[PDB]
Subunit: 317 residues, 2 copies
Amino acid sequence: GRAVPGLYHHPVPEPDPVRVEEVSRRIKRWAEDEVQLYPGQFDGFSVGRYMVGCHPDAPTVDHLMLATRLMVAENAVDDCYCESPVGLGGRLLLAHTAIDHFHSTAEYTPTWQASLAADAPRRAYDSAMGYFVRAATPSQSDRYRHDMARLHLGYLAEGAWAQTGHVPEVWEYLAMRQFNNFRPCPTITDTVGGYELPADLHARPDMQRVIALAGNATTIVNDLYSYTKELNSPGRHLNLPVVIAEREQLCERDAYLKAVEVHNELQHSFEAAAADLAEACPLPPVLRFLRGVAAWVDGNHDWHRTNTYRYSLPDFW
Amino acid sequence: GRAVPGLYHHPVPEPDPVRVEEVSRRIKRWAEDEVQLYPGQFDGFSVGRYMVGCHPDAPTVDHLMLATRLMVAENAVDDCYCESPVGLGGRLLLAHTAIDHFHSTAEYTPTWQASLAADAPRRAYDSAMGYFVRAATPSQSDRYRHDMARLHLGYLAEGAWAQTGHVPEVWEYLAMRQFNNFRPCPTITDTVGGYELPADLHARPDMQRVIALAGNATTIVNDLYSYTKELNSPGRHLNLPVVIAEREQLCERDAYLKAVEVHNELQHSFEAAAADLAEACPLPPVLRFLRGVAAWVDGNHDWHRTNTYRYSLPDFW
Ligand SMILES: CC(C)=CCC/C(C)=C/CSP(=O)(O)OP(=O)(O)O
Ligand SMILES: CC(C)=CCC/C(C)=C/CSP(=O)(O)OP(=O)(O)O
Ligand SMILES: [Mg+2]
Ligand SMILES: [Mg+2]
Ligand SMILES: [Mg+2]
Ligand SMILES: [Mg+2]
């Protein structure tokens, strides 16, 4: 329950247990009844607290469920596909067509259509994206598809390196982790909050830097909380402390403490860039979106800190 | 110089030789002087005719050069990286950061910055995208990055299959080819034409189907013209006739003729969907963009038909 010592973060209120329970019951029903996700590790309570904590402005549980089904589907892919298969690029492209559809001839379209029911990851993406596309504006859907293309490219860099046991330089690992990253989750904060960050404002270079820094900081949070778990993962699973240690030839402890400082610099930079843009462009949807990304990041730190079933901390302090 | 018999296409005017020559001289200078592309196969005349023919509405050669440097950079990646490396996913993600930049700490940012000069593909993307970002709106830049993420995912499906000599089902091959696809070229037709298709109109589902069908048809054109060349490529290089033949157990000839019919159905569907959207949404930028995608597709068919240095036709008629 303790935060990583020295990790810069902001406390968050206990998530509303009425919403956590309602999310938990509905996501279990979606998993079992609509997409047949499994035949435990899956808990509804875990993801319910996660999403309530990360989206305090959601008007309804229906809004929370848009993010929740997409998070569960993302998990199902990383679980069924990403553990390192040589054939990953083919599997992931076909699953990506549940997110960005295939357009083809009368002959081939139905065969693709049938593939969307073929396994749990595609049933999960097809169904989760279908609820999102109904709720969100076409620009919000397109933005999510781009963030998912980023994430799939991220997985495929990590998998290519794992095929040869390659340890990239630290900045190379960080570049992969900018893509293989929580980013598709905080960037839907506007859809989940029932409003829209207009596309031309999303596309501003300064906003794109804000989003990347937030995703980068909050993904390094996961490196830090999941570091001890990953020591048992197959092969040598990369995370920032492992890569710094191996490339910079540092003991695990000193590498882990430097990773904490890297996280802090990213989090502070995210905050300064967000403050600058809020001043440069104080339109209400921009300010709402920036606050919502911050809330997602703080909520993601809280979930990792409290999830003692998935994570524990190394003995370094 | 002859078109594939039975291939549905539209003739185009001979490209303006004054513009072809000016594009040729400037792209050779960019290649040699700015990005050190090589130490022949590269001709300026080839790509000059290509881009003039595909962008008849470009106001200036500067506009044509925005597309031309990006096409040459795309080629450089496919040439230096894609021929099948196990480490492709890592190489391509790092090159993608020349298109969608890395955001990191004061320590790691400059090391990434130096990597953008490290090889010809990254110097080519960094420089070509830098001219594009200066010219285009932030929404047009963001749209190009998404189309490049699609293309890199496409390469990585093709490379994952090539690692095991896997022949996917035909619709699976077509799904990969929807991504590994000319799409990033016709979708910049508005930037090259000096106007903007507004982002919310680009994101409409019907427009996204139009774009996918156009890219799919015009990419299958390349399968058909490059079929005889690819028979000498390493391994068994996939294209629609090869995949249909191997999965459907047809002789090469009958598979090739069916591929021509598939191309035709995609091209007709593209046209019908474009006509429907022009009627549904007759705003001038939409109608300009649809005409510009059509011109790119017709120009791409013409370039393949006339490029007897890269391509020849099989003896099937
Ligand atoms: C879009 C979503 C949910 C995730 C993006 C990929 C991602 C950041 C997964 C969480 S990080 P990962 O190291 O892979 O997972 P853990 O086992 O450490 O929990
Ligand atoms: C964005 C650009 C230029 C290309 C996208 C990838 C693409 C369609 C390359 C042309 S198809 P490809 O079979 O790879 O090349 P060819 O040797 O047949 O000429
Ligand atoms: Mg992972
Ligand atoms: Mg982890
Ligand atoms: Mg290729
Ligand atoms: Mg080809």
